[PDB]
Amino acid sequence: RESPAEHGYYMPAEWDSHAQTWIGWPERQDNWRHNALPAQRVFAGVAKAISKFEPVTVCASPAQWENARKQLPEDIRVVEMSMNDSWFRDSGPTFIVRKRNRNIAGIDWNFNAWGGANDGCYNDWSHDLLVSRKILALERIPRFQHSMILEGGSIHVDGEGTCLVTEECLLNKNRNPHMSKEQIEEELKKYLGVQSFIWLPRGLYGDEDTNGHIDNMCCFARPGVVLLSWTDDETDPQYERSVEALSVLSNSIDARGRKIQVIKLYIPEPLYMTEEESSGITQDGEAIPRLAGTRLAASYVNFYIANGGIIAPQFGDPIRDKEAIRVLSDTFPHHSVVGIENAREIVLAGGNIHCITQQQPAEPT
Ligand SMILES: [Mg+2]
Numbered sequence: 381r382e383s384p385a386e387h388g389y390y391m392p393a394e395w396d397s398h399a400q401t402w403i404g405w406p407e408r409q410d411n412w413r414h415n416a417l418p419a420q421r422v423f424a425g426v427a428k429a430i431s432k433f434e435p436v437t438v439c440a441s442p443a444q445w446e447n448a449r450k451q452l453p454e455d456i457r458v459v460e461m462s463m464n465d466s467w468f469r470d471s472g473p474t475f476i477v478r479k480r481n482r483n484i485a486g487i488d489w490n491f492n493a494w495g496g497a498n499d500g501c502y503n504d505w506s507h508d509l510l511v512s513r514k515i516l517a518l519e520r521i522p523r524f525q526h527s528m529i530l531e532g533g534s535i536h537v538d539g540e541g542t543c544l545v546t547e548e549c550l551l552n553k554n555r556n557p558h559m560s561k562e563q564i565e566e567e568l569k570k571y572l573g574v575q576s577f578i579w580l581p582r583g584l585y586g587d588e589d590t591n592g593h594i595d596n597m598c599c600f601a602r603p604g605v606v607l608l609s610w611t612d613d614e615t616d617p618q619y620e621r622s623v624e625a626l627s628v629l630s631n632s633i634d635a636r637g638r639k640i641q642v643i644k645l646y647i648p649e650p651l652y653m654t655e656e657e658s659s660g661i662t663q664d665g666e667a668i669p670r671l672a673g674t675r676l677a678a679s680y681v682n683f684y685i686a687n688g689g690i691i692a693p694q695f696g697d698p699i700r701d702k703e704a705i706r707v708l709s710d711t712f713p714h715h716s717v718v719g720i721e722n723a724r725e726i727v728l729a730g731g732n733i734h735c736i737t738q739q740q741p742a743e744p745t
Pocket of ligand 1: 471488489490491508509512513
């Protein structure tokens with residue numbers, strides 16, 4: 381059980397350089413309406429958008445492999461890999477680099493479908509348990525295994541000592557109930573190479589099924605500067621969570637000694653599951669219900685950082701969609717912002733774009 385700290389590795393920020401980006405492929409009918417064709421189209425657009433900036437590796441199950449290979453341009457690598465769902469942010473390896481056996485490693489955290497037998501999103505995650513090792517074993521990258529539950533969507537970093545997380549997820553009884561905050565914290569200092577932490581109380585409103593991972597709540601936009609899901613509608617259940625996190629962050633000082641500057645990134649108008657979308661879900665007794673009228677957990681903070689690229693959602697609220705793009709462009713002056721139409725199609729299953737990706741950092745030399 382040696383740690384990454386003992387070998388010099390740590391996790392770099394999303395803005396650092398990447399070899400390529402990993403993405404899975406949707407399939408299960410109890411989570412992807414209409415035999416997943418609508419979401420397959422959006423996943424495929426996501427993978428084509430990211431390939432304009434950097435190489436994409438898509439992975440599809442044996443049954444789906446030919447379908448994904450026909451849909452995607454040949455420039456997108458398509459590899460066979462069995463999984464139980466397609467959120468590679470959370471079953472993907474969290475990659476870590478060493479500054480001086482390769483110069484890149486990846487951690488394979490334990491997984492339980494966002495809480496386990498009694499509070500998770502589905503009842504069988506056996507294939508999801510090998511996707512971590514299958515990716516690093518296909519890339520010939522060393523694997524540090526952890527027995528603690530953890531999802532990449534529940535942990536962010538600035539690449540300079542500050543890990544950003546959520547109490548709702550990390551300190552949840554469906555996660556690591558026998559671990560205190562200092563135990564879990566000590567593991568993250570050891571495995572992510574971090575020194576300090578910023579704990580926001582909860583995840584985004586409507587993310588109760590996954591326990592509120594941070595990438596739908598807040599991330600860093602560069603050092604010392606985080607984007608925060610926001611609303612001014614005081615009647616929305618999200619407003620008290622945004623103002624709460626704004627209080628916390630504005631009194632936060634990072635590991636390098638900087639006062640945190642929060643930029644607000646306004647969520648779209650409230651979005652709700654429709655009967656046309658819910659009735660496309662096949663109820664089989666293996667996944668949680670997807671009901672019309674539902675408050676879909678939808679925020680623009682759940683984008684991806686590719687080499688000089690920003691892959692951002694478009695949810696259909698034309699006013700909020702345009703205002704998120706203005707906000708993001710003002711923020712990554714050295715990247716090009718690209719939008720994904722029908723973002724709402726991967727969000728019906730509770731996630732979006734960052735949710736579906738796994739960056740592989742370029743290996744140092
Ligand atoms: Mg794993």
